[PDB]
């Protein structure tokens, strides 16, 4: 596997978005992974609709602004036959009527692949060979809310009780040695003003810190 990976540098990642006051991070994590896989398939980067997932995936077990799961979102896109673009189905951060329009669909998936739970090396192999990967993490800390720079490490993090979905867009390391000061490159959905231009470096190979490899997955396009 490569010493470092950064899918943003290859055109697979849309600019940072903002879920605002709606518990839809699972929808942003799923659209981010589908955006990367659709770009790997077609060469076209198209921003996808989180609101389509918030309003329409209750049958699959999501709860809109009250939370949801990235795998249930990829299940909805499979059962539904498509997912609309961000431009055609705009984000409003509140639960609304499902307005899915097949004529505006720009993405599809046949299901999803799960990464072995808790295995950071399996997650590293998926990020390197597939593209951006949906992951859940423990973001329930003021250290995360006010994160600004550097490798994030929080002693109070959990690897099993997770409350937020994010997108791993790569991994890297600080310095000359590729085997230490490692980190996961994570795209959040709290706007570009949060964190480091909307991203955070989470400590890597530090016992699955904040649960990043506990429940990772990606859509099959």
């Amino acid at each position: 596997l490569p010493k470092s990976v950064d899918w943003r540098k290859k055109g697979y990642v849309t600019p940072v978005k903002n879920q605002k006051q709606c518990g839809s991070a699972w929808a942003f994590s799923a659209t981010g992974a589908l955006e990367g896989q659709m770009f790997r398939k077609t060469g076209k980067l198209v921003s996808l609709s989180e609101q389509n997932l918030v309003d329409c995936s209750r049958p699959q077990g999501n709860q809109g602004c009250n939370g949801g799961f990235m795998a249930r979102a990829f299940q909805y896109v499979k059962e539904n036959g498509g997912l609309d673009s961000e431009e055609s189905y705009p984000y409003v951060a509140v639960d609304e009527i499902c307005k899915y329009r097949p004529e505006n669909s720009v993405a599809q998936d046949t299901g999803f692949t799960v990464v072995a739970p808790g295995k950071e090396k399996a997650l590293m192999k998926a990020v390197a060979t597939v593209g951006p990967i949906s992951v859940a993490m423990d973001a329930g800390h003021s250290s995360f809310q006010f994160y600004k720079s550097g490798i994030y490490f929080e002693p109070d993090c959990s690897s099993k009780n997770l409350d937020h979905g994010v997108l791993v867009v790569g991994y890297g390391f600080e310095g000359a040695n590729s085997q230490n000061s490692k980190y996961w490159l994570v795209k959040n959905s709290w706007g570009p003003e949060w964190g480091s231009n909307g991203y955070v470096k989470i400590a890597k190979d530090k016992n699955n810190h904040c649960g990043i490899a506990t429940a990772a997955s990606y859509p099959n396009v």
Partner: peptide, 8 residues
Amino acid sequence: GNYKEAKK
């Protein structure tokens, strides 16, 4: 695997 909490 993580259904203990929804991912808000």
